Amino acid sequence: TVYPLHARSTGVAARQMLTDFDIRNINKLSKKKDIFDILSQSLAPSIYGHDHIKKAILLMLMGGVEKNLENGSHLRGDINILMVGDPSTAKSQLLRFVLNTASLAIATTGRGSSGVGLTAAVTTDRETGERRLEAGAMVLADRGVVCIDEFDKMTDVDRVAI
Amino acid sequence: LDIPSRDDDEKLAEHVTYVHMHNKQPDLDFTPVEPSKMREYIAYAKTKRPVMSEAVNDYVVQAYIRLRQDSKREMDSKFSFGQATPRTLLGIIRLSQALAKLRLADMVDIDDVEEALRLVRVSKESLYQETNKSKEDESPTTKIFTIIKKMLQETGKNTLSYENIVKTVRLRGFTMLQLSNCIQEYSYLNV
């Protein structure tokens, strides 16, 4: 049997189907106008303030409305948000949600976590004596939200992949 | 250079959002072609190899000359595209040939190469102002004056007996009362 990667949603790991209790909890939540604000407390475990940033996080977690235009490019409906602040405290705290908690967030330091290559690289190996591709983790990722900390530590050739 | 205007950010944005509404930018009057059969027709055109028409040459040539001379008096000037080259001429010819391909015709049209010139010049002056003016519309007596000026280029006399002047005015159609009025004005204007 071949049950491949979960096609419609993100990869196989999430499995966030719902039960009647879960559907009822989600409905009881969503129909309430106020919940959008408590999400800020849901994304402010250690730092406080900048709840607008919490809104941004939950939005970019939603996914967007990236639409496939006929006979043309699928328009980008997803969003990528840059953050900059105290490299000591701002980065660690705001990161530690998307890193540890949310989902499918490959930690990316820039130069280092590029590994072999963030984008790709043609590699002709002695093992089979043949050339394949090295797809970076982000491009290996499908539908996720990749976190790139320490962005200013990019190698020069990286600056174009973005 | 994206001049930040208002009607652009209105229409462009509206129509992008309309794309989100209706996934076809084509409005009521439009014939969008799917890229597949578009490609088909395009390649078919590419398999034609039209011929350069003999008449347009002079015009083409003259165009080049113009596109040359101005360039010199525009070298250090604002639009610093320096010294348009024979490659520009050749590119114009190639553009005309491709438009004739779009005609699927083996003879390039004067309108064809004129459109090519329009393309090459619209690339220019798209930097700033993008406007011009006109003054010579009225000419109810200034036209008489310019005719007189050509006559002066011939000889250059401020005579007191006008017989070829009145003849050329009558040929021009302008009446003799307006002519005499203008003569009054310019004699008073001391010419």
From Swiss-Prot, chain A:
Subcellular location: Nucleus
Binding-site residues, ATP: G85, D86, P87, S88, T89, A90, K91, S92
Residue span, MCM domain: 35-162
Superkingdom assignment: Eukaryota
Protein's job: Acts as a component of the MCM2-7 complex (MCM complex) which is the putative replicative helicase essential for 'once per cell cycle' DNA replication initiation and elongation in eukaryotic cells. The active ATPase sites in the MCM2-7 ring are formed through the interaction surfaces of two neighboring subunits such that a critical structure of a conserved arginine finger motif is provided in trans relative to the ATP-binding site of the Walker A box of the adjacent subunit. The six ATPase active sites, however, are likely to contribute differentially to the complex helicase activity.
Note: Present with 35100 molecules/cell in log phase SD medium.
Subunit text: Component of the MCM2-7 complex. The complex forms a toroidal hexameric ring with the proposed subunit order MCM2-MCM6-MCM4-MCM7-MCM3-MCM5; loaded onto DNA, forms a head-head double hexamer. Interacts with CSM1.
Similarity comment: family membership: Belongs to the MCM family.
Protein's UniProt name: DNA replication licensing factor MCM3
Organism: Saccharomyces cerevisiae (strain ATCC 204508 / S288c)
Residues of the full protein shown: 325 to 486 of 971
From Swiss-Prot, chain B:
Coiled-coil ranges (or none): none
Keyword ATP-binding appears in the UniProt entry: yes
Binding site for ATP 2: R87
Keywords of this entry: ATP-binding, Cell cycle, Cytoplasm, DNA replication, DNA-binding, Helicase, Hydrolase, Nucleotide-binding, Nucleus, Phosphoprotein
Keyword S-adenosyl-L-methionine included in the entry's annotation: no
Superkingdom per UniProt: Eukaryota
GO function term, MF aspect, one: single-stranded DNA helicase activity
Compartments, as annotated in UniProt: Cytoplasm; Nucleus
Any Gene Ontology CC annotation: nuclear replication fork
One of the protein's GO biological processes: DNA strand elongation involved in DNA replication
Function: Acts as a component of the MCM2-7 complex (MCM complex) which is the putative replicative helicase essential for 'once per cell cycle' DNA replication initiation and elongation in eukaryotic cells. Core component of CDC45-MCM-GINS (CMG) helicase, the molecular machine that unwinds template DNA during replication, and around which the replisome is built.
Any further remark recorded for this protein: Present with 166 molecules/cell in log phase SD medium. Early fractionation of eukaryotic MCM proteins yielded a variety of dimeric, trimeric and tetrameric complexes with unclear biological significance. Specifically a MCM467 subcomplex is shown to have in vitro helicase activity which is inhibited by the MCM2 subunit. The MCM2-7 hexamer is the proposed physiological active complex.
Assembly: Component of the MCM2-7 complex. The complex forms a toroidal hexameric ring with the proposed subunit order MCM2-MCM6-MCM4-MCM7-MCM3-MCM5; loaded onto DNA, forms a head-head double hexamer. Interacts with CSM1 and MCM10.
Family: Belongs to the MCM family.
Protein name: DNA replication licensing factor MCM7
Source species: Saccharomyces cerevisiae (strain ATCC 204508 / S288c)
